Ligand binder design. Structure first.
Ligand SMILES: [Ca+2]
Ligand SMILES: [Ca+2]
Ligand SMILES: [Ca+2]
Ligand SMILES: [Ca+2]
Ligand SMILES: [Ca+2]
Ligand SMILES: [Ca+2]
Ligand SMILES: [Ca+2]
Ligand SMILES: [Ca+2]
Ligand SMILES: [Ca+2]
Ligand SMILES: [Ca+2]
Ligand SMILES: [Ca+2]
Ligand SMILES: [Ca+2]
Ligand SMILES: [Ca+2]
Ligand SMILES: [Ca+2]
Lengths: 338, 95, 338, 89
């Protein structure tokens, strides 16, 4: 009945973004007030020595949308972009986390991809993680937003910074045009895809990589889960082992990541987190990116898988590997113990 | 998104103010002479001179009534507000 | 979707892209002119060195009530009284002219009266001018306003500064209860009044001032005119000469002024202006007061009599005896050349 | 002051808040209008702005065809918004 309301109803198109995930660790704050949060954050920033505690407490306990509202209110109050203010006020890994949290999921993924390809030294691990784990919708929005942010198609940058079948696979996946989940189980096609995967790889000298690429990028995820299960009937090694035997380097890394994402994405992210912390120091880039990007998607399942496999909680490992306000932020994004 | 933006609230006020007075006498969706004068005198006293010629008010009413039905609907009320704002902008621009 | 609806509305509106037809009426009803005048005056004031030219051009070319409108708008916009601002910004005679113009006729007359009675001394010339020249209506409004501007009645302050039959005359006149014009001539009362006025002064060894005051304050103006013309049949001297021979001083001056007004008020003001500019320098007080007080009363008649008697226009003498924006203001009040 | 007066004042000042950033200080170019909408009516264009539709809007708001939006055209725009919202009374 108000102008804001009218314009909102009219603006909502037909698509309401998408329904929220019940498996995210970060939920929408119930008693949300964007102005109060913007004000408190401003006062925390302008406090001598900077009050990181308050900034973390607020931002890690608001949904991404709510963070956008906070950013808007903050710009309206101070005539300064919140991301810039926090960039100048913060440092180290905490800065990376907060700045990551301030971006929309598409903006965040786009800038992580760009960063992975920026400079002659390409970061294949990050590129692979993002391109192999994102769904059709997520990738459509990523292609769009990447194009808006950097004035270049994501695909062209991928092509510029990759080569061979690794390039072909990355480009194929990035298109985000995987077949959607059908209502019928295509048993015949499951069997035929299993046979084709076997024939293209372990059964022959060398590898028919384009066959693998076609099957593993075009078929729906449930179909491919069944295909990988049927594949074990034909091959003495499962899909992952077969990949390890057939290919190497970037291509192998990409296929392993992809098959993991298809079989069990939460487990995939749990293993990546473990890898980021298990050894000397921390792979902070990966840790942070995963804690930020999965915080409202499947962090609860990631935590479940992690605790099940490694025996201690994700919370525990973060707690042992990081310190200070940075640690506190990551633990907030974790959601809790176990 | 609570706390509507200034311009949104301004539009809200503009819309509600019309029905605040049009919903008193006669047509519930139109303003007559009396209702319009109430709206002017009460909601915009800062725009009224020290004195008010009734003939100038009649000419105003006649000019706002574009379709000639002895009343001012929301559209003509909008062109009125537009005129007021344009006066304000005249005072803003040069000075 | 909002854009769609907006476009439909725009098509409904059309591209009428000239100042809308109702704009004129809106400006008229809201008194746009007074607001513009006010803003221009404020700009002229705040201008370094003060732009007196614009102040004069505007204020001396507006009617008194229009000046009241401009003062109202100025006070509403600046949150400062126009009279005070112009008081600070102006000086010399131009200040007294502009400040004089800002008052209503009754307020101006009252302030001039209090000014004439201010101090240990008294400007009985100004007092005589106002009291003898103003009509009954004007005098009643002057009383009512004087009683509000200051704590006391006009008559009270009058009888506190004058004395004797001069006081009696000034009070009688200031009463403003003169008999109004009559449809009947009443020739008998005319002859009796004239002959009484003769028997009260010239024929007598002394002079009967009370009878003089009574007759010349109670009777109506036309009746008194015919009485004064009938007086020329009984006395070898006209009324003015008789006054000049029967009484001296302030009473003489008062009687002369009164008879002059009664016989021909515009000619009275014309002669008074001529005297104000006649000799060395200028009687600026008188000139200013007359030009201000009569600009919207009988200025055309004053100019007519002035031109008729002195050969050249009031405009000419004003131009010759005054210079600068002061001169411009006076000439503006004059209304043009003759 | 009175609510409608403050509303009008917001209307007037908001225009000049964005009109004076680039080029003609008394007219809104495309980017200036876009910014005004983005900051003052965020739900108008929505999360993702249809550039084609926005160009149509800019084009139709530009009655005198000088590729920019002056104050009168801006008044027509706001009037259209107010009428649209009024229709859902
Ligand atoms: Ca600190
Ligand atoms: Ca920093
Ligand atoms: Ca590169
Ligand atoms: Ca092989
Ligand atoms: Ca470690
Ligand atoms: Ca009505
Ligand atoms: Ca009408
Ligand atoms: Ca000067
Ligand atoms: Ca002074
Ligand atoms: Ca005295
Ligand atoms: Ca005698
Ligand atoms: Ca002289
Ligand atoms: Ca501009
Ligand atoms: Ca235009």
């Amino acid at each position: 009945s108000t102008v804001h309301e009218i314009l909102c109803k009219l603006s909502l198109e037909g698509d309401h973004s998408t329904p929220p995930s019940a498996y995210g660790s970060v939920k929408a704050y119930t008693n949300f007030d964007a102005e109060r949060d913007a004000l408190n954050i401003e006062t925390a920033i302008k406090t001598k020595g900077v009050d990181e505690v308050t900034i973390v407490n607020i931002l890690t306990n608001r949904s991404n949308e709510q963070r956008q509202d906070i950013a808007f209110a903050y710009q309206r109050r101070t005539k300064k972009e919140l991301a810039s203010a926090l960039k100048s006020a913060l440092s180290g890994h905490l800065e990376t986390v907060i700045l990551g949290l301030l971006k929309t999921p598409a903006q965040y993924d786009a800038s992580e991809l760009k960063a992975s390809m920026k400079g002659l030294g390409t970061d294949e691990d990050s590129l692979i993680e993002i391109i192999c784990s994102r769904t059709n919708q997520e990738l459509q929005e990523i292609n769009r937003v990447y194009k808006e942010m950097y004035k270049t198609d994501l695909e062209k940058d991928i092509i510029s910074d990759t080569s061979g079948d690794f390039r072909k696979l990355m480009v194929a996946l990035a298109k985000g045009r995987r077949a959607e989940d059908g209502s019928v189980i295509d048993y015949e096609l499951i069997d035929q895809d299993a046979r084709d995967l076997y024939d293209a790889g372990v059964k022959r000298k060398g590898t028919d990589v384009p066959k693998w690429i076609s099957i593993m990028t075009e078929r729906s995820v449930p179909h491919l889960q069944k295909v990988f299960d049927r594949y074990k009937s034909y091959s003495p090694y499962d899909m992952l082992e077969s990949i390890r035997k057939e290919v190497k380097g970037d291509l192998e890394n990409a296929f392993l990541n992809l098959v993991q994402c298809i079989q069990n994405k939460p487990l995939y992210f749990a293993d990546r987190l473990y890898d980021s912390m298990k050894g000397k120091g921390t792979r902070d880039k990966v840790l942070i990116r995963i804690m930020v990007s999965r915080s409202e998607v499947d962090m609860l399942k990631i935590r479940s898988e992690f605790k099940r496999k490694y025996g201690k909680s994700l919370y525990y490992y973060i707690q042992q590997d990081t310190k200070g306000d940075y640690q506190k932020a990551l633990l907030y994004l974790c959601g809790g113990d176990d | 998104s609570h706390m509507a933006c200034p311009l949104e609230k301004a539009l809200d006020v503009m819309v509600s103010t019309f029905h605040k007075y049009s919903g008193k006498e006669g047509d519930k969706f139109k303003l007559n002479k009396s209702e319009l004068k109430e709206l002017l005198t009460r909601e915009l006293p800062s725009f009224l001179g020290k004195r008010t010629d009734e003939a100038a008010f009649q000419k105003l009413m006649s000019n706002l009534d574009s379709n000639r039905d002895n009343e001012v609907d929301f559209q003509e009320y909008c062109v009125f507000l537009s005129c007021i704002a344009m006066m304000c902008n005249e005072f803003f621009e040069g000075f």
